[PDB]
Amino acid sequence: KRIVKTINIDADKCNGCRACEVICSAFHAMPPYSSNNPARSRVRVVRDPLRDIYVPLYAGEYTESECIGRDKFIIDGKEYDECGFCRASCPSRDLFREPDSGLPLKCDLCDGEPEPLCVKWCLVGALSVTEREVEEPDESVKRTEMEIGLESLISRFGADVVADTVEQL
Amino acid sequence: KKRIVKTINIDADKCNGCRACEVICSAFHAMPPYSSNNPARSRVRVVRDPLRDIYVPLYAGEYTESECIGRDKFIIDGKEYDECGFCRASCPSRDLFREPDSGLPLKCDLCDGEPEPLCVKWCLVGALSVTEREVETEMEIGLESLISRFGADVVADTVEQ
Amino acid sequence: MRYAETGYVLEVDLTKGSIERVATDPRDTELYLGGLGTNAKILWDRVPPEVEPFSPENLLIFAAGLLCGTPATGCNRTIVSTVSPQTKLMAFSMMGGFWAPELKYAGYDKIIFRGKSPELVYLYINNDKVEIRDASHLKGKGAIETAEIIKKELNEPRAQVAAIGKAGENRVFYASIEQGRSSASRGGIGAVMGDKGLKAVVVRGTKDLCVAKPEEYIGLCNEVLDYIKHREENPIPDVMPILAGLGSPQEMKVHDEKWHTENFNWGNARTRRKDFWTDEVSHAWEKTMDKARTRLISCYNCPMKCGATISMEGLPTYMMKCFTKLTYTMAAYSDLDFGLRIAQKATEYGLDGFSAPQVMAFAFELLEKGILKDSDFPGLPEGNEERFFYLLDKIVNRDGIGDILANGTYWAAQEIGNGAEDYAHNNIKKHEQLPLKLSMLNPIYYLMYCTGEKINITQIEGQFPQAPYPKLEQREAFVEDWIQVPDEKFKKIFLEWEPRGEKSMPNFPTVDMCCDIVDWQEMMHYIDDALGQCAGLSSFPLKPPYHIHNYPKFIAAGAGIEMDTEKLKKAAKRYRTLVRAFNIRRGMRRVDEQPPANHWKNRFPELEKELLDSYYKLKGWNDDGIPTKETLDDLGLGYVGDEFIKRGILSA
Ligand SMILES: CC(C)(COP(=O)(O)OP(=O)(O)OC[C@H]1O[C@@H](n2cnc3c(N)ncnc32)[C@H](O)[C@@H]1OP(=O)(O)O)[C@@H](O)C(=O)NCCC(=O)NCCSC(=O)C1=CCCC=C1
Ligand SMILES: Nc1nc2c(c(=O)[nH]1)N[C@H]1C(S)=C(S)[C@@H](COP(=O)(O)O)O[C@H]1N2
Ligand SMILES: Nc1nc2c(c(=O)[nH]1)N[C@H]1C(S)=C(S)[C@@H](COP(=O)(O)O)O[C@H]1N2
Ligand code: SF4
Ligand code: SF4
Ligand code: SF4
Ligand code: SF4
Ligand code: SF4
Ligand code: SF4
Ligand code: SF4
Numbered sequence: 001k002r003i004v005k006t007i008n009i010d011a012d013k014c015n016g017c018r019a020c021e022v023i024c025s026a027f028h029a030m031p032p033y034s035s036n037n038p039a040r041s042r043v044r045v046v047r048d049p050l051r052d053i054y055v056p057l058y059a060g061e062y063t064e065s066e067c068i069g070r071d072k073f074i075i076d077g078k079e080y081d082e083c084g085f086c087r088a089s090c091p092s093r094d095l096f097r098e099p100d101s102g103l104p105l106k107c108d109l110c111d112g113e114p115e116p117l118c119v120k121w122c123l124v125g126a127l128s129v130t131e132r133e134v135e136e137p138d139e140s141v142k143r144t145e146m147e148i149g150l151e152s153l154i155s156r157f158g159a160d161v162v163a164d165t166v167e168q169l
Numbered sequence: 170k171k172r173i174v175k176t177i178n179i180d181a182d183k184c185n186g187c188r189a190c191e192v193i194c195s196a197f198h199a200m201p202p203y204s205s206n207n208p209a210r211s212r213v214r215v216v217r218d219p220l221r222d223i224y225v226p227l228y229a230g231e232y233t234e235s236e237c238i239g240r241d242k243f244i245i246d247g248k249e250y251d252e253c254g255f256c257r258a259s260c261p262s263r264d265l266f267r268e269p270d271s272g273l274p275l276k277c278d279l280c281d282g283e284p285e286p287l288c289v290k291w292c293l294v295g296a297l298s299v300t301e302r303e304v305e306t307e308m309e310i311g312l313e314s315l316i317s318r319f320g321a322d323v324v325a326d327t328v329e330q
Numbered sequence: 331m332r333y334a335e336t337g338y339v340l341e342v343d344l345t346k347g348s349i350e351r352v353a354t355d356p357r358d359t360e361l362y363l364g365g366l367g368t369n370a371k372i373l374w375d376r377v378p379p380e381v382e383p384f385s386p387e388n389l390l391i392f393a394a395g396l397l398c399g400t401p402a403t404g405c406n407r408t409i410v411s412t413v414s415p416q417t418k419l420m421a422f423s424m425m426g427g428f429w430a431p432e433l434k435y436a437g438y439d440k441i442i443f444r445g446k447s448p449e450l451v452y453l454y455i456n457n458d459k460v461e462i463r464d465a466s467h468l469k470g471k472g473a474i475e476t477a478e479i480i481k482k483e484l485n486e487p488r489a490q491v492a493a494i495g496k497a498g499e500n501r502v503f504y505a506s507i508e509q510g511r512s513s514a515s516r517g518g519i520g521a522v523m524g525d526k527g528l529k530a531v532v533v534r535g536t537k538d539l540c541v542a543k544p545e546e547y548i549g550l551c552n553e554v555l556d557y558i559k560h561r562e563e564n565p566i567p568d569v570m571p572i573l574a575g576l577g578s579p580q581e582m583k584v585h586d587e588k589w590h591t592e593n594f595n596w597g598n599a600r601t602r603r604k605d606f607w608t609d610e611v612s613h614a615w616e617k618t619m620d621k622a623r624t625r626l627i628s629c630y631n632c633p634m635k636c637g638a639t640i641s642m643e644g645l646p647t648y649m650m651k652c653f654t655k656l657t658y659t660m661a662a663y664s665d666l667d668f669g670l671r672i673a674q675k676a677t678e679y680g681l682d683g684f685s686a687p688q689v690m691a692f693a694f695e696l697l698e699k700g701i702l703k704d705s706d707f708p709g710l711p712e713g714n715e716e717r718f719f720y721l722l723d724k725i726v727n728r729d730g731i732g733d734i735l736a737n738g739t740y741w742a743a744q745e746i747g748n749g750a751e752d753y754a755h756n757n758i759k760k761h762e763q764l765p766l767k768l769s770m771l772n773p774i775y776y777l778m779y780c781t782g783e784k785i786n787i788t789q790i791e792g793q794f795p796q797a798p799y800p801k802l803e804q805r806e807a808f809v810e811d812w813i814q815v816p817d818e819k820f821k822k823i824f825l826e827w828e829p830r831g832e833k834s835m836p837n838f839p840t841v842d843m844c845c846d847i848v849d850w851q852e853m854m855h856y857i858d859d860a861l862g863q864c865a866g867l868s869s870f871p872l873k874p875p876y877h878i879h880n881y882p883k884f885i886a887a888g889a890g891i892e893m894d895t896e897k898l899k900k901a902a903k904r905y906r907t908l909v910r911a912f913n914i915r916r917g918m919r920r921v922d923e924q925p926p927a928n929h930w931k932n933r934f935p936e937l938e939k940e941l942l943d944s945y946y947k948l949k950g951w952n953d954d955g956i957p958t959k960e961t962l963d964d965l966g967l968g969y970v971g972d973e974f975i976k977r978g979i980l981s982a
């Protein structure tokens with residue numbers, strides 16, 4: 001057996017405040033809480049009051065390429081955005097990529113912290129994290145954000161210009 | 170520079186849950202084509218739960234080598250969807266978008282080379298359509314962020330790999 | 331290597347607990363195709379007449395049609411077969427949805443159950459893995475409810491489940507088997523499932539399923555889809571809106587119920603209400619339905635979306651299609667709201683929505699005249715609607731009078747006596763018919779009522795119009811593109827047929843024309859029920875996309891065996907004649923082939939005799955209804971004739 005963690009998002013309780021984006025990015029500032037910047041949040045709220053759409057989306061896995069076709073839903077009379085539910089750190093869009101460098105971002109459930117802070121700061125309780133045991137093994141190729149980051153750069157700029165500047169700094 | 174972006178428009182309000190799309194996508198991608206079919210092999214998979222009034226056609230997206238640290242799970246407009254319910258990923262956490270025999274990943278290529286997406290063609294209630302539109306240094310900054318969060322020694326050592 | 335069919339069956343002994351995969355004979359496929367056809371062959375030579383319905387040796391069979399699991403549109407039907415506890419004849423029964431395809435992707439053509447489990451269990455199938463799971467925690471749980479609990483239990487969100495409710499668990503003679511928006515409803519197959527201690531059958535399938543001539547095959551499917559598009563842009567002119575298009579009767583989409591409510595009898599098939607369909611009622615019922623219908627939904631691989639999820643306040647969601655929408659409403663002399671409500675309970679319990687309503691209306695007519703007393707209804711509530719709820723629960727648990735009522739109107743009457751027999755006026759062969767009591771004898775329907783092995787008028791009719799057109803122009807318009815007719819003569823008949831006059835019923839069409847029409851209409855059902863094709867795109871509606879001329883092409887490209895129009899006709903004849911032999915061996919004789927005495931106000935003894943005489947000869951049967959030696963021989967059914975001679979069924 002092994003534990004699986006779930007982010008339970010009641011989009012029907014979300015009020016669109018984006019407090020979640022405020023605290024996530026603030027925690028991930030260096031040093032922690034020294035600045036904040038919703039663009040750096042690993043949780044980003046799809047927010048359109050005119051369509052009554054309030055959907056908190058969490059930074060998922062990294063992809064180096066776009067999909068051949070993008071998807072776009074109508075569900076229960078709501079016309080959602082292109083790729084509106086995708087969690088990918090993807091080259092097609094700014095979400096879950098650092099605004100000033102394009103570095104892939106990933107939610108890690110505030111690892112090393114007592115609890116997810118977005119959950120903590122969401123006072124109406126739209127957010128929660130629970131866990132359960134499952135039988136299926138973790139066949140994941142676990143890989144540090146450190147090497148995910150650099151790998152996206154080598155990908156984007158070639159292993160030449162990257163090696164050039166690392167020693168250079 | 171202007172390149173082309175294709176969008177699969179999915180009106181889930183019009184979906185009747187018949188899974189004809191799964192039938193024809195898998196059939197077309199048999200070898201030789203149409204020689205067989207098998208919904209497990211389809212690059213379009215329908216989330217279908219009549220008792221929740223959920224009918225959501227889902228297309229094969231990008232490959233990922235590992236799962237997320239946290240799996241998301243939405244309640245939206247009274248409907249309690251599945252964990253990872255909207256994810257396109259060909260992912261180790263589940264069977265969707267992977268061959269049921271070899272586990273190898275599947276990608277929708279919009280029936281590249283064909284006159285027309287077959288899933289679209291067999292969806293007689295027209296819940297599916299595909300449309301087109303044209304679309305229109307940071308490296309340096311990124312590399313700093315890395316040094317400043319994991320240390321200059323770490324960044325260096327990793328460059329050699 | 332086999333195509334279209336998987337080529338294997340699962341043989342399961344519920345007594346021993348044994349499960350075995352068996353290769354089938356590729357000749358039985360050439361001879362009998364699959365589905366109903368192969369089901370019958372197995373019944374014929376494994377269930378002799380000495381066997382009771384609740385004998386351990388009764389077989390309960392689940393079959394996917396031969397083309398289920400292929401890309402053919404609408405081809406998704408499960409055929410369940412057994413000996414009916416009610417009729418004591420063969421009961422075959424069809425269920426749509428998604429189960430039959432899933433069984434084929436799992437790798438199997440059929441599951442043959444024998445024996446009885448002493449404890450309640452269910453069968454679990456995941457590709458090559460098959461086991462018997464304990465089911466005692468599911469005792470008495472509704473059929474749909476049971477399916478959801480099982481899927482959680484096993485973590486198989488995409489498995490398909492066929493289950494019985496409490497009705498079946500108590501061996502109610504009209505107990506059904508339910509799967510999502512699909513039901514094997516009639517003849518008590520649900521009771522035989524329950525008698526065997528079998529609570530459900532869960533299947534999951536992810537194997538491939540091949541067809542012989544790929545390009546040729548997908549070509550025919552596209553041709554069918556193109557025809558479906560055409561046909562929906564072109565409804566049959568001047569025809570009841572539910573019967574003008576493709577699909578099962580489109581009663582979830584269409585709110586116009588004038589036809590039904592004004593021509594079919596209410597109560598215990600007792601009362602016509604010729605002026606029932608007022609603007610007031612039309613709006614009330616539309617309001618109710620608009621609010622109840624959550625979504626129109628399809629079976630596997632079909633765009634016609636005939637069924638609907640139904641949500642009534644404070645009641646779990648359930649699914650519905652076709653005439654069950656009105657049977658409880660009309661039996662109870664009530665409104666659409668009441669029908670939808672009680673139908674939810676009766677679907678969970680798992681009850682035949684044709685027989686149940688009449689059984690209950692039956693009972694209350696007996697209370698009325700005094701043949702039953704108030705004492706037989708302890709705690710009988712006051713209100714009319716409450717009373718149907720009260721009786722439904724008693725039947726399903728076999729509580730007091732429910733134990734009697736749960737055996738159907740035929741057996742209940744003969745148990746109650748005192749003249750109850752007079753009130754079981756709507757049976758053929760101990761099976762309730764549709765609540766129709768018309769005026770003028772219809773010679774076409776006369777033959778279908780008498781001879782249909784399903785004993786249900788709605789599952790033998792379809793290909794030929796129910797009424798004639800007044801104007802020649804209209805008839806010529808209709809035959810014009812009628813490509814489905816096996817032969818040009820059917821156009822000529824429909825051209826000559828008129829509503830009134832020399833060429834009107836019951837004297838026209840002629841006796842021989844009627845025999846030809848009924849033969850054609852029935853042949854297409856038998857083909858559908860072997861292939862696994864939904865009758866909604868075939869035998870049931872006018873001008874279907876599947877028909878006698880392209881069906882052989884489908885079978886040839888699909889299963890890789892030679893097939894043309896004539897050989898297909900002869901195949902369908904072969905196992906329709908086999909089903910016949912079965913019911914003959916179980917004692918059925920010409921005497922049993924009679925509609926209810928009051929089924930038409932105007933009868934013609936001499937005309938009826940010539941009809942049935944002539945139909946038998948067309949069938950190549952006796953004047954007693956038994957297939958003859960020479961017919962059995964030509965059909966490849968030598969072993970039938972020889973057995974008939976040894977039993978003295980046929981003199982040598
Ligand atoms: C029921 C039906 C409307 C016939 O109603 P009609 O009113 O036309 O026929 P009628 O009542 O016989 O006669 C009325 C008057 O005409 C008179 N008369 C007659 N002929 C005459 C002549 N030649 N000349 C002169 N007069 C002639 C009669 O004497 C009578 O006069 P009266 O009042 O003074 O006594 C039509 O659908 C039908 O015939 N179906 C056939 C089979 C059937 O039962 N189909 C349904 C099966 S289930 C199904 O399919 C489903 C589907 C979906 C879900 C669930 C189920
Ligand atoms: N092959 C076949 N398909 C059939 C039928 C049949 O008898 N045989 N009955 C039709 C009718 S009248 C109805 S109402 C639906 C019922 O579908 P269900 O058995 O899944 O409840 O099946 C339709 N498709
Ligand atoms: N419980 C239940 N009974 C039902 C139905 C149903 O959908 N659910 N369908 C009715 C209709 S419209 C038809 S055509 C027959 C189909 O008979 P079968 O399921 O035995 O093939 O069952 C009738 N009884
Ligand atoms: S803090 Fe809660 S209510 Fe506010 S936007 Fe974030 S998820 Fe929604
Ligand atoms: S955002 Fe997600 S769904 Fe859209 S192109 Fe990128 S990976 Fe595909
Ligand atoms: S759990 Fe932590 S890392 Fe993930 S989005 Fe919430 S605040 Fe950010
Ligand atoms: S073919 Fe159309 S209606 Fe059917 S499941 Fe696919 S998208 Fe939905
Ligand atoms: S299926 Fe998608 S959301 Fe779920 S764990 Fe995998 S990548 Fe993340
Ligand atoms: S567009 Fe083509 S490849 Fe993509 S899901 Fe449809 S049939 Fe499959
Ligand atoms: S025609 Fe109707 S009943 Fe038949 S397969 Fe299609 S949706 Fe199902």
Ligand SMILES: [Mg+2]
Pocket residue numbers: 423424425426512513514515
């Ligand atoms: Mg049925």
Ligand SMILES: [W+6]
Pocket residue numbers: 578579652653788
């Ligand atoms: W029906």
